[PDB]
Structure 1
Amino acid sequence: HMASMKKKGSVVIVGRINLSGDTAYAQQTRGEEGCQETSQTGRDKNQVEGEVQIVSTATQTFLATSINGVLWTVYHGAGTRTIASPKGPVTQMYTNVDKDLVGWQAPQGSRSLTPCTCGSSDLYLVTRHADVIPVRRRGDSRGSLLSPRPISYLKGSSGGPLLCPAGHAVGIFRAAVSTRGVAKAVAFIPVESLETTM
């Protein structure tokens, strides 16, 4: 009934991947109880830092990456949800189900990656566990892992970046190709497809 109808909560930043120094490591900035409360209110007063955020809904967790002032993630994680912010829920600025892509204005305090113009095919995928995984680019939206590993190790890293040797954004991780549970290849939204959308 219309009186009964519920509202989905916001996406919430619950941590980050720290790439500041010589060692990449994940940091949690909010626990599950505070995450649930912030998803319901959409009001997140925590300080945001860095380029790759770990984000959560009530039911899923994944990554979001700032590139050129937009916090980008996957539609299959975020759907059409708002993101929590200090002043309340923020509506998506970009939504493209056909690319599995959404974006919001990048949160104050975040740092944005620069879009890659190198044309390099030697990429690096950053996971929610702060693994930096070498990936050879194999097409506009595909790359192969140099060291395959079970898909378990990639689960929850959609929305994370593929970076070039110079640390620029080449794309947003979207999906994995699984052969008997082993990830041999990944698919990603290329940064040019974000640059078009903008």
Structure 2
Amino acid sequence: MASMKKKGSVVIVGRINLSGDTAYAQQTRGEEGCQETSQTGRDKNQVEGEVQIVSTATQTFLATSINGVLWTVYHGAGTRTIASPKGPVTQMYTNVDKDLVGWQAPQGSRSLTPCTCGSSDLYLVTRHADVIPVRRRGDSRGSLLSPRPISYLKGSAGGPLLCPAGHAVGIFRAAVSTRGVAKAVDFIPVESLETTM
């Protein structure tokens, strides 16, 4: 028991910048700093924007701020704390059944607003900063209008589905693939987030 360790914190290691006419990924922490920060839970880096790239020891994925909470998928983060300026921060919300977790959003981050457009014309934002058009087909599913290999969506879970105006419609959870090609996406709708809150 003396040698028993705690799980590391989730660490913010970059962001998906959607502020211009061009989407792009930025790294803010390399692997050494990520490892250190995961162990201490102390992250003194300034966080900015809506969509963060987060990492554990085994996965790199996305987390999206909506209504002042930084949301991601349970299959990425599990029950982990997130590193912060004040030390490790415990989850505010944990729901394995929805594949959804959330922490209070980092100081200096920006939150997306939930979509009030009633829009079914969506855009998926990926960990590689691709913006992929998606037509919504139900509460929690949409079809890719432009096929991608499923490998191209690796680490996009936790990122947003946006409406044409840039409002949050949902959090990407998982893709449906045929012969390696993603044809549809499953997501956690923003209403489900609101209910959890």
- TM-score norm. by structure 1 comes to 0.98
Secondary structure of the residue aligned to 1:76 is helix
Instruction: Give how far 1:46 is off.
Output: 0.3
- SS at 1:192's partner residue? helix
What is the number of equivalent residue pairs in this alignment?
197
Q: How far does the alpha carbon of each residue in 1:43-63 deviate from its partner, in whole angstroms, 9 at most, with x for none? A: 000000000000000111100
Q: CA-to-partner distance for each residue in 1:118-161, whole Å, 9 max, x for gaps? A: 11100000001111100000110000000111101001000000
How much has 1:86 moved relative to structure 2? 0.4
Compute the displacement of 1:77 (Å). 0.2
In the TM superposition, what is the alpha-carbon distance from 1:3 to its structure 2 partner?
1.9
Rounded Cα–Cα distance in structure 1 between residues aligned with 2:108 and 2:71: 15
Match of 2:149 in 1: 150
Q: Following TM superposition, by how much is the alpha carbon of 1:27 offset from its aligned partner in structure 2, in angstroms?
A: 0.4
Secondary structure of the 2:102 match is strand
CA distance in 2, matches of 1:101, 1:197: 9
- Tell me what 1:185 maps to: 184
5+ residue gaps, structure 2, are none
1:68-115 residue CA offsets vs partner (Å, 9 max, x unmatched)? 100000000000000000010000000000000000000001000000
Residue 26 of structure 1 aligns to a residue whose secondary structure is strand
Rounded Cα–Cα distance in structure 2 between residues aligned with 1:160 and 1:172: 6
Cα RMSD for the two superposed structures: 0.6
Q: Percent identity?
A: 99
Deviation at 1:6, TM superposition (A): 1.4
What are structure 1's unaligned runs of at least 5 residues?
Answer: none
Taking the aligned partners of 2:52 and 2:128, their CA distance within structure 1 comes to 12
- Shift >2 Å, 4+ stretches: none
Aligned to 2:106: 107
Cα distance in 2, alignment partners of residues 143 and 126 from structure 1:
14
State how far apart, in whole Å, the 1-side matches of 2:178 and 2:117 are: 31
Residues in 2 aligned to 1:137 and 1:9: alpha-carbon distance in whole angstroms: 36
| 1:158-196 deviation per Cα after TM superposition (whole angstroms, max 9, x unaligned) | 000000011100000000101111100000000000011
Q: Which residue of 2 aligns with 1:62?
A: 61
**Residue deviations 1:8-62, cap 9 Å, x none?**
1000000001111111111000001110000000000000000000000011110
Shift of 1:4: 2.4
Aligned partners of 2:113, 2:146: CA distance in 1, in Å?
27
Distance 2:82 2:61 in 1: 13
Relative to the length of structure 2, the TM-score reads: 0.99
